[PDB]
Design a protein around this ligand. Structure first.
Ligand SMILES: *[C@@H]1O[C@H](CO)[C@@H](O[C@@H]2O[C@H](CO)[C@@H](O)[C@H](O)[C@H]2NC(C)=O)[C@H](O)[C@H]1NC(C)=O
Ligand SMILES: *[C@@H]1O[C@H](CO)[C@@H](O[C@@H]2O[C@H](CO)[C@@H](O)[C@H](O)[C@H]2NC(C)=O)[C@H](O)[C@H]1NC(C)=O
Ligand code: TLF
Ligand code: NAG
Ligand code: FE
Ligand code: ZN
Ligand code: ZN
Length: 341
């Protein structure tokens, strides 16, 4: 064993990472960067080993040679004999969510509305909806489709950032890390809940986890699922209990990536760290829970039951799936070979 150097994105992940490192007796230590892209560069340079990534960022890391190691696995819909670590992953449902009270907004009337996105380059947040929209409109001018948005990672003076709010101080508007008030699944959903945006592009789970008292957080504690609808590609609106019939795509789960040459070591260490700090882990909750952060999804989604071994030593293309990979390649033609770095 060597120590594994985790890469934390922004200061709130970094703080979580430091508690993990303390509790692991330095089996894990922490590098931190301002953006996911910057953490991927640290890993490429060998200044960090690994981080957990959305599928759109796996595409970026993968084009640069990093490889998937273990995947987030959340509670299966169906009972399984299989241990979590062995259970195959089931993707998550990317959806578009609006206020029920915003009547008559549908997928087909999104143009010139206000949008909330988890971040540029992320799956449910970006790649799926904007790939869909570019294709449906026949235009690469996706930066002109909504009147204003919060899409963290975009140009802070552009309309794609006009709705983002920055941190407590109002600084770091539109930065793609949890300091941006509207960053990520929970930030984009809060962007909708507070009626900053007309639509949020998130996943099905986000809606459930932040409504009907599932979150105690001040902005979320009062929210009721019935006040929300999903937008279906057929132009219909459904209640959020129907995401299986009204989603934009099924996404590949967030997964850990590292360099090939560190993958087996990163895997071993993680399997052991989750035995200690994961769901039901020997030292969670008394000491530290790797998969909790007060709904802030820091390092890992809060709904992760375990990190699960992958079948078939998949390359990043195999992990993401050919179709998703081709959807991303297609969209990036708007703004098929090389590492972006
Ligand atoms: C947007 O349209 C593109 C361009 O047609 C779609 O790309 C095709 O996807 C199919 C199914 O995976 C492939 O058989 C074709 O080879 C792809 N065409 C090209 C030119 O690459 C893409 O999937 C659509 N995007 C989204 C997000 O649905
Ligand atoms: C959409 O996401 C929600 C939230 O994760 C899912 O509801 C959970 O489903 C599990 C497994 O069925 C239940 O044991 C949980 O108690 C549910 N959580 C809550 C907060 O209600 C829901 O199944 C997902 N829907 C689809 C179609 O995938
Ligand atoms: C539509 C869908 C369902 Cl329903 C389930 C699962 C996936 C999809 N779609 C896609 C899957 C991968 C890549 C691109 C797409 C897309 O067409 O946006
Ligand atoms: C640190 O790692 C070594 C080697 O795997 C092991 O003996 C020890 O259990 C680990 N401790 C923690 C607290 O993760
Ligand atoms: Fe995602
Ligand atoms: Zn589907
Ligand atoms: Zn293979």
């Amino acid at each position: 064993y060597t120590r594994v150097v985790w890469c934390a994105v922004g200061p709130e992940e970094q703080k979580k990472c430091q508690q993990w490192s303390q509790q692991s007796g330095q089996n894990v230590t922490c590098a931190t960067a301002s953006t996911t892209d910057d953490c991927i560069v640290l890993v490429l340079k060998g200044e960090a080993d690994a981080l957990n990534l959305d599928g759109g960022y796996i595409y970026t890391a993968g084009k640069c040679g990093l490889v998937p190691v273990l995947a987030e696995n959340r509670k299966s819909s169906k009972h399984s004999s299989l241990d979590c670590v062995l259970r195959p992953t089931e993707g998550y449902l990317a959806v578009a969510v609006v206020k029920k009270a915003n009547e008559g907004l549908t997928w087909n009337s999104l143009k010139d509305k206000k949008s909330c996105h988890t971040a540029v380059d992320r799956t449910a947040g970006w790649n799926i909806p904007m790939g869909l929209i570019v294709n449906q409109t026949g235009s690469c001018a996706f930066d002109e489709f909504f009147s204003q948005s919060c899409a963290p990672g975009a140009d802070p003076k552009s309309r794609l950032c006009a709705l983002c709010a920055g941190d407590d101080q109002g600084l770091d508007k539109c930065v793609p890390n949890s300091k941006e008030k509207y960053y990520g699944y929970t930030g984009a959903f809060r962007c909708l809940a507070e009626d900053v945006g007309d639509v949020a592009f998130v996943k099905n789970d986000t809606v459930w986890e932040n409504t009907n008292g599932e979150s105690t957080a001040d902005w979320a504690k009062n929210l009721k699922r019935e006040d929300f609808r999903l937008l279906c590609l057929d132009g219909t609106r459904k209640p959020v209990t129907e995401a299986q019939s009204c989603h934009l795509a099924v996404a590949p789960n967030h997964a850990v990536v590292s360099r090939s040459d560190r993958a087996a070591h990163v895997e071993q260490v993680l399997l052991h760290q989750q035995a200690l700090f994961g769901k039901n882990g020997k030292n969670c909750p008394d000491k530290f829970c790797l998969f909790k952060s007060e709904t802030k999804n820091l390092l890992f989604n809060d709904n992760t039951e375990c990190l699960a071994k992958l079948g078939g030593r998949p390359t990043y293309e195999e992990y993401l799936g050919t179709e998703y990979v081709t959807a991303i390649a297609n969209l990036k033609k708007c703004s098929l070979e090389a590492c972006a770095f």
